[PDB]
Design an enzyme around this catalytic site. Structure first.
Site, PDB file in Angstrom:
ATOM      1  N   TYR C   1       0.810  -1.212   0.000  1.00 38.87           N
ATOM      2  CA  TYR C   1       0.000   0.000   0.000  1.00 38.87           C
ATOM      3  C   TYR C   1       0.856   1.280   0.000  1.00 38.87           C
ATOM      4  CZ  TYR C   1      -3.893   3.125   1.510  1.00 38.87           C
ATOM      5  OH  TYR C   1      -4.815   4.113   1.655  1.00 38.87           O
ATOM      6  N   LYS C   2       0.195   2.422  -0.194  1.00 44.54           N
ATOM      7  CA  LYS C   2       0.730   3.787  -0.126  1.00 44.54           C
ATOM      8  C   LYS C   2       1.390   4.102   1.222  1.00 44.54           C
ATOM      9  CE  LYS C   2      -3.442   5.098  -1.462  1.00 44.54           C
ATOM     10  NZ  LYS C   2      -4.565   5.991  -1.824  1.00 44.54           N
ATOM     11  N   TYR C   3       2.160   5.181   1.293  1.00 40.85           N
ATOM     12  CA  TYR C   3       3.014   5.486   2.446  1.00 40.85           C
ATOM     13  C   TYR C   3       2.247   5.702   3.756  1.00 40.85           C
ATOM     14  CZ  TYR C   3       6.191   7.789   5.638  1.00 40.85           C
ATOM     15  OH  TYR C   3       6.896   8.060   6.762  1.00 40.85           O
ATOM     16  N   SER C   4       1.272   6.609   3.765  1.00 42.10           N
ATOM     17  CA  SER C   4       0.742   7.144   5.026  1.00 42.10           C
ATOM     18  C   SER C   4      -0.129   6.155   5.806  1.00 42.10           C
ATOM     19  CB  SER C   4      -0.027   8.434   4.762  1.00 42.10           C
ATOM     20  OG  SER C   4      -0.482   8.988   5.976  1.00 42.10           O
ATOM     21  N   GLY C   5      -0.779   5.198   5.142  1.00 44.48           N
ATOM     22  CA  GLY C   5      -1.781   4.354   5.781  1.00 44.48           C
ATOM     23  C   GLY C   5      -1.246   3.604   6.996  1.00 44.48           C
TER      24      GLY C   5
END
Lengths: 23, 103, 497
Positions: C1-5
DNA sequence: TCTAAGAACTCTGATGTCAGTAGATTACACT
DNA sequence: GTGTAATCTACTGACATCAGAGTTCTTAGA
């Protein structure tokens, strides 16, 4: 997929248990 | 009561209701403190905690049975303290304590 | 997944008497097992990822706490960033007295319904605002038929858990040594993604493992200027970077509140709170004083703009491994800029490996930094361990010293040993042969520091004091090696020491 | 008969970085 | 004018990092 990925901390690779010198 | 005013207490533990210990003290006006400085009279604890062990290790202060701040409530018990520094600049506190302590 | 999650994780224990107060042995207890698990993954997540979310929930208890769909469920803890007071809430329920402490409060063995339990947890994840990368539920029940006696009760659960999986919340399981048997193929076969004693997975939740875990992120992005004109975007990534004990936050004694360090500059003569424009910077040389502004002590030390200029090519043997500057960093392509530049980089990678070659570059990580010189050594991946990629393919930035760095070292000359003195050594060395692996050691200080910090945090009885792995285990070095230190003491030097 | 100049290590504080969030600025547009 | 886009530029959490300052040790040492 499952084989290398830790259940405590997902996506990150499983931390193996420290080792040290043993012959 | 007007007796426990001017006498400062630390209620470092309870468990008897700990937050009510200082409330009973408050209608006797005993001066509540959360963490004992070198100023305080004595420290009150319903059981041991690691901070009480720190105050066994640092001979610092007067430690008192639970009941003494539920029996102060029928007496007037009011008794002292410390912090730390050892000093030999041109040493100063020990010679002040030749004026200010028994030897 | 993407960075912030965030990772987000909810723990959901069966409060039912038939497991809760139950043992075949005396030596464990399934509730005392699950609560230990929840405290122990939670103390792992505190040191390692304070950013990631935990919750814990009891189902089938008799006194309730929920938003809605209330019957016989108690959310002990809603979703939150993890810390000490939450670990103290779980601690209260642990042990032989603990299994009575819980009974004075939420009450035990009543009827329950998984299709409502899965509803509750769903509402929980919904209620939180943060972006979540992994959404996972953990089942701590042994009840292998989850009282699906009414198949028209059970089809609700199975459909609702279809709806969990359909909404991209995941769910995960552990079986807990039910007396005589447990078999997933009866039920839970379709809830998870031949017969068991107790899960081989569950011991991994007791690893108590500690580090920061910090996800894949760039250090910076740069343009590899091959000349005045051709450029490719590359990333710059930190494969090896020494960890530190976290920065300490100064506190007010009397209340434990955080306090601001609030520094100013003040004129030694007068009340002037001197502004940054009031004062310059300076040096002393040759009994005279040199004066420069707060702009120009950092106009000096400029040469270039952020990029990587190509300087031509070398043999990999001439890049001598004795002179090493600072930790090597990875280079990997980034289509985020300079689209299709990956096509050039990939050919460059492939063909350097044939030439036995490095590229030399000049490297500036920022504006207002001097160029260092860096060899781009090319790299190749060992996927042979069933695609556990021990090594990513790309380039290493290996840094090179300049004249000033290579410090003078004193005079000495000798070529002293005989072939017997090497010959005895060639034995001891081959007796002391092990296998180093990069991960085989841990920092004695930083590991000890966390154990001290936990003792203070929970008000434990003791610092765990877990002894380090860097000391040589000298009795094994006595025995494996054997007595052969005497070959030096006899064959190589006199008896005077 | 010893007193600073020269090392060495850790730690603290600022500057710059990246990813992601969301506001306010400004553009585009009405027959 | 009035109203609805599209989109630049900010701020923050977080991570690395140079510098700068606090601290113990060698030589040259009255």
């Amino acid at each position: 997929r499952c084989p290398g990925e830790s259940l405590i901390n997902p996506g990150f690779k499983s931390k193996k248990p420290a080792g040290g010198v043993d012959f | 009561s007007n007796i426990f005013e001017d006498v400062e207490f630390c209620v470092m533990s309870g468990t008897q209701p700990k937050p009510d210990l200082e409330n009973r003290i408050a209608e006797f006006g005993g001066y509540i403190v959360q963490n004992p400085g070198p100023d305080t009279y004595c420290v009150i604890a319903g059981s041991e905690n690691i901070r009480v062990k720190n105050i066994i290790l640092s001979n610092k202060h007067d430690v008192v049975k639970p009941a003494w701040l539920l029996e102060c409530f029928k007496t007037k018990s009011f008794v002292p303290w410390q912090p730390r520094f050892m000093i030999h600049m041109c040493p100063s506190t020990k010679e002040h304590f030749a004026r200010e302590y028994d030897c | 997944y993407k960075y912030s999650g965030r990772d987000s994780l909810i723990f959901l224990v069966d409060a039912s008497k038939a497991m809760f107060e139950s043992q075949s042995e005396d030596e464990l207890t399934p509730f005392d097992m699950s609560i230990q698990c929840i405290q122990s993954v939670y103390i792992s997540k505190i040191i390692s990822s304070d950013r990631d979310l935990l919750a814990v929930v009891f189902y089938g208890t008799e006194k309730d706490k929920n938003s809605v769909n209330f019957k016989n469920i108690y959310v002990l803890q809603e979703l939150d960033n993890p810390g000490a007071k939450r670990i103290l809430e779980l601690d209260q329920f642990k042990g032989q007295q603990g299994q009575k402490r819980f009974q004075d409060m939420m009450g035990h063995g009543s009827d329950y319904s998984l299709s409502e339990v899965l509803w509750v947890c769903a509402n929980l994840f919904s209620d939180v605002q943060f972006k979540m990368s992994h959404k996972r539920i953990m089942l701590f029940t042994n009840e292998d038929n989850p009282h699906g006696n009414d198949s028209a009760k059970a089809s609700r659960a199975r459909t609702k858990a279809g709806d969990l999986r359909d909404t991209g919340i995941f769910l995960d399981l552990m079986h807990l040594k039910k007396p005589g048997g447990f078999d997933i193929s009866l039920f839970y076969r379709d809830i998870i993604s031949v017969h068991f004693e107790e899960s081989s997975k569950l011991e991994d939740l007791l690893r108590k493992v500690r580090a920061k875990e910090t996800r894949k992120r760039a250090l910076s992005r740069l343009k590899l200027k091959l000349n005045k004109d051709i450029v490719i975007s590359v990333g710059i990534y930190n494969l090896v970077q020494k960890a530190l004990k976290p920065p300490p936050i100064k506190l007010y004694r009397e209340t434990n509140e955080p306090v601001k360090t609030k520094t100013r500059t003040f004129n030694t003569s007068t009340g002037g709170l001197l502004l940054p424009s009031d004062t310059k910077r300076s040096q002393i040389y040759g009994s005279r004083q040199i004066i420069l502004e707060k702009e120009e002590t950092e106009e000096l030390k400029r040469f270039d703009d952020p990029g990587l200029m190509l300087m031509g090519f070398k043999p990999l043997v001439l890049l001598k491994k004795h002179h090493y500057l600072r930790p090597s960093l990875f280079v990997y392509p980034e289509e985020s800029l300079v689209i299709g530049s990956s096509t050039l980089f990939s050919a460059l990678l492939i063909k350097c490996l044939e030439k036995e070659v490095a590229a030399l570059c000049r490297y500036t990580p920022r504006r207002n930094i001097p160029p260092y010189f860096v060899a781009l050594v090319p790299q190749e991946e060992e996927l042979d361990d069933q695609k556990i990629q021990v090594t990513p393919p790309g380039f290493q930035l290996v840094f090179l010293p300049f004249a000033d760095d290579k410090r003078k070292m004193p005079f000495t000359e000798k070529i002293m040993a005989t072939p017997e003195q090497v010959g005895k050594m060639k034995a001891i060395v081959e007796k002391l042969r092990f296998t180093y692996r990069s991960d085989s050691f841990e920092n004695p200080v930083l590991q000890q520091h966390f154990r001290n910090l936990e003792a203070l945090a929970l008000d434990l009885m003791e610092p765990e004091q877990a002894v380090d792995l860097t000391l040589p285990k000298v009795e094994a070095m006595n025995k494996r090696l054997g007595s052969l230190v005497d070959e030096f003491k006899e064959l190589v030097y006199p008896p005077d020491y």
